[PDB]
Design a protein around this nucleic acid. Structure first.
Length: 270
DNA sequence: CGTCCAGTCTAC
DNA sequence: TAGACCTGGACGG
């Protein structure tokens, strides 16, 4: 998942947990190489926020919840399959690697981090990854400045399609958004990144880095996702103009990732 | 049955 | 850089 999916997953946790109270421990699957969450409360609320391709849960005990516990923050990266679901406690999906359990009164639910391929990670401590740039969705001006002020970096020597995956400058952009953004401006994907960015130093490339992903969020649904039904998933495939679409070209970048585009591949093409 | 395809992370 | 980390669906024989 990319920035829109991290964002929608955060909105899901906030809306679906608004009136839920969790209790007990935070349970990790035995196969998961991620750390155990040292947290226990008779009564805590779960809330979320997204920044780029990371999501932060806050575990907030209620007044007088036992054991005495301070709020705990967990930050998640989703890799290729990460996901959050609210399921009935005894109908855990396969690959539910981390689980928060509702307290009574009510139907016993589990909020689960579900990750088929286990590329996802969480760290104890609530901090965003050092080095990740501002969120293209929620910190646009900070995102735009962090790019324009550092065009000297060797990161911008590379093809624009490669630079757009560097989470130090485009936190929240992944393989589908880089195709959709470049297609909107018909920028050849193997144009040099510094060449296309220097001008800014009729929406430009950095505006689209915000507004294109915002469109996926505004579809509602769960972006490149089905944790909302088939309706929302087909809604997303219909929004796509370029990623995977018939009559589009594709090449491998230097990291073996597929870039979709129309027309001129650009000068630094392999 | 088999191949091929779908975001970091780190050891060369 | 390239291979590693994973599972599963879509396809081909």
């Amino acid at each position: 998942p990319e920035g829109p999916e991290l964002h929608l997953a955060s909105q899901f946790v906030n809306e679906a947990c608004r009136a839920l109270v969790f209790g007990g421990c935070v349970e990790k699957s035995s196969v998961s190489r991620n750390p155990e969450v040292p947290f226990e409360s008779s009564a805590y609320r779960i809330s979320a926020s997204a920044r780029g391709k990371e999501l932060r849960l806050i575990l907030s005990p209620l007044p007088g919840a036992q054991p005495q516990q301070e709020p705990l923050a967990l930050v998640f990266r989703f890799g290729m399959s990460g996901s959050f679901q609210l399921v009935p406690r005894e109908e855990l999906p396969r690959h539910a690697h981390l689980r928060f359990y509702t307290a009574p009164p009510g139907p016993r639910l589990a909020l689960c981090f579900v990750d088929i391929r286990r590329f996802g990670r969480w760290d104890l401590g609530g901090k965003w990854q050092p080095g990740r740039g501002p969120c293209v969705l929620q910190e646009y001006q900070q995102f735009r400045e962090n790019v324009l002020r550092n065009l000297a970096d060797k990161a911008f020597d590379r093809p624009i399609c490669e630079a757009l995956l560097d989470q130090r400058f485009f936190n929240g952009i992944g393989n589908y958004l880089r195709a959709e953004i470049l297609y909107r401006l018909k920028i050849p994907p193997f144009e040099k990144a510094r060449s296309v960015l220097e001008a800014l130093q009729n929406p430009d490339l950095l505006e689209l880095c915000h507004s294109v992903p915002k469109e996926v969020v505004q579809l509602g649904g769960r972006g490149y996702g089905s944790e909302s039904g088939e309706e929302d998933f087909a809604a997303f495939r219909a929004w796509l103009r370029c990623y995977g679409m018939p009559g589009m070209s594709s090449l491998q970048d230097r990291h073996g990732r597929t870039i979709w585009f129309q027309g001129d591949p650009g000068p630094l093409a392999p």
